[PDB]
């Protein structure tokens, strides 16, 4: 339709669990042929894997390019400046991407099951909600006990942006359905979230039936004319 170039930032899962910060440069809508050119400024991995000239629907051909790298440099603030020299232009066209600034770490909440779902004794629902983070990408995992559940057992949505209290932030959700014989018995569950703006890049929250809403509370206040030392 119209030749437009784009760089793409490396994927969150590969970068957090490893260092495979692979970049990706792609022009879309070439004129006739596949004889295109590519050039980055950090020519470290000169074996840049140019992919096959795939197509796209309603009359569109696209070219890809990958410059493989390691997690180290991307986190220190370098810059990457892909180029292209497709024949339908008389002057090349560039794009540039780097790491983000003005970040915010998320707020993670883990909600207990509701009341009218426990009175049916079949299944219960846990809900993890992460809110208030500046870049749009985030990870969500689950745990039962200390063993990670496989990814086909729960449902995660995408990351939308919330209405503005001044500045721009995002939010996600995920739910997990659990056999009610295991919640009432005393098993513990956990929600883990990974994001760029966190200090150790991961944070988790654990819940069980003892850390929920109780039905009898006993408060006992004790005065101390003696001293304050808390033996």
């Amino acid at each position: 339709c119209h030749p437009r170039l784009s760089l793409h930032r490396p994927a969150l899962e590969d970068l957090l669990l490893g260092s495979e910060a692979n970049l990706t440069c792609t022009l879309t809508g070439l004129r006739d042929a596949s004889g295109v050119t590519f050039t980055w400024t950090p020519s470290s991995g000169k074996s840049a894997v140019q992919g096959p000239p795939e197509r796209d629907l309603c009359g569109c051909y696209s070219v890809s390019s990958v410059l493989p790298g390691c997690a180290e440099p991307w986190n220190h603030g370098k810059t990457f400046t892909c180029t292209a020299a497709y024949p339908e232009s008389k002057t090349p066209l560039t794009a540039t991407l780097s790491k983000s600034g003005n970040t915010f770490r998320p707020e993670v909440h883990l909600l207990p099951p509701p009341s009218e779902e426990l009175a049916l004794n079949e299944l219960v629902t846990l809900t993890c909600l992460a809110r208030g983070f500046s870049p749009k990408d985030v990870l969500v995992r689950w745990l039962q006990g200390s063993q990670e559940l496989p990814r086909e057992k729960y449902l995660t949505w995408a990351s939308r942006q919330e209405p503005s209290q001044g500045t721009t932030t995002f939010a996600v959700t995920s739910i997990l359905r659990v056999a009610a014989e295991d919640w009432k018995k005393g098993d513990t569950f956990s929600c883990m979230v990974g994001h760029e703006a966190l200090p150790l890049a991961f944070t988790q929250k654990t819940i069980d039936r003892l850390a929920g809403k109780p039905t009898h509370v006993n408060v006992s206040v004790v005065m101390a004319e003696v001293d304050g030392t808390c033996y």
Binding site: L17, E107, V108, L118, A119, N121, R141, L143, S146, E148, K184, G186, M192, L198, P199, L200, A201, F202, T203, Q204, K205, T206, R209, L210, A211, G212, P214, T215, H216, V217, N218, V219, S220, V221, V222, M223, A224, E225, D227, G228, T229, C230, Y231
Partner: protein, 131 residues
Amino acid sequence: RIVLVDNKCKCARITSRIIRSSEDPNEDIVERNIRIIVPLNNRENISDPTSPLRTRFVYHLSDLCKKCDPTEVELDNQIVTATQSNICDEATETCYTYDRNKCYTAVVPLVYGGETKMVETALTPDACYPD
């Protein structure tokens, strides 16, 4: 019983217990007990001339139960370190009691001859010994 939290900065202790029922199992019982020790003879800030007695004490549950220490999780085939709370602001908390295992000193200026020296006192004398 299972110990949920035992906080020494405010001297709070929280335990809990589940008591089942083998008669229409929605009459189950979950119990939680909270134990609070209120001091009546120490200051607001822990430094000696300060607002002669604290008279108002505030206990928020989410501030007592927080876990401000890291942990290790095994996700697929690695081990990663993770934090456990949102409220771990970086130490400026106001404690209500002293801690039996910690030191608390103070600095006082005194005069010895034609000079002035700056010496150090002890407010909990059992717990500050160079060993």
